[PDB]
Amino acid sequence: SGAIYVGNYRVVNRHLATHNDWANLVWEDSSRDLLVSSTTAQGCDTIARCDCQTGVYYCSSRRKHYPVSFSKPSLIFVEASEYYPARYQSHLMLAVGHSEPGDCGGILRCQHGVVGIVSTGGNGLVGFADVRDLLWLDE
């Protein structure tokens, strides 16, 4: 679990969105595993606008933050699940690091702010759904 609170927006993994998220929907994209819903309170998270490939992510399964090198956002294949059929997930970035079912939603940060959230993982790898291209989160 985990979300990004920026302005009147809440960003979450689409496969973990609640009824309130769907009732206050702004935008959703299955191929990215992203859903953005509206909030009445102002969120205090800064989004990064960069091409950083180093950052720090929160791993709830270890209650620890880890530094990682990560790849450029791309279409990476993702196996079937109770949430999605087998497909290519776009805007996905991989890093060598621990993650397990329950870690989705952990924020990845660089020196410029929020880069994205944990969305995939397995075999010593962890995938992050990038949010840096979503320029409307600040306007």
Ligand X SMILES: CSc1cncnc1CC(=O)N1CCC[C@H](C(N)=O)C1
Site residues (vs ligand X, CB under 6 A): 15, 33, 78, 81, 83-84, 89, 99-101, 103-104, 118-122
91 sits in which H/E element:
strand 87-96
Tell which positions 20-39 bind Zn ion, by CB under 5 A. none
Three-state SS at 116? strand
- Pick the catalytic residue from 59, 91, 103, 104: 104
* 15 annotated active-site: yes
* 59 annotated active-site: no
Is 112 among the residues that bind Zn ion (CB under 5 A)?
A: yes
Per partner kind, with CB cut-offs from 5 to 8 A, the member of Zn ion, ligand X, none near residue 119 is ligand X
Six-digit token string for 61: 């399964």
* 104 annotated active-site: yes
- 110: Cβ contacts below 8 Å, ≥ 6 apart: 48, 50, 52, 54, 55, 56
- 80: Cβ contacts below 8 Å, ≥ 6 apart: 86
For the CB of residue 86, give the shortest distance to ligand X in the complex, in Å: 9
Per partner kind, with CB cut-offs from 5 to 8 A, the member of Zn ion, ligand X, none near residue 112 is Zn ion
**Rounded Cα gap, residues 123 and 113, in angstroms:** 27
Instruction: Give 39 or 61: the residue with its C-beta nearer to ligand X.
Output: 61
Instruction: Give 133 or 138: the residue with its C-beta nearer to ligand X.
Output: 133
Cα 87 from chain centroid (whole Å): 17
Catalytic residue numbers?
15, 33, 104
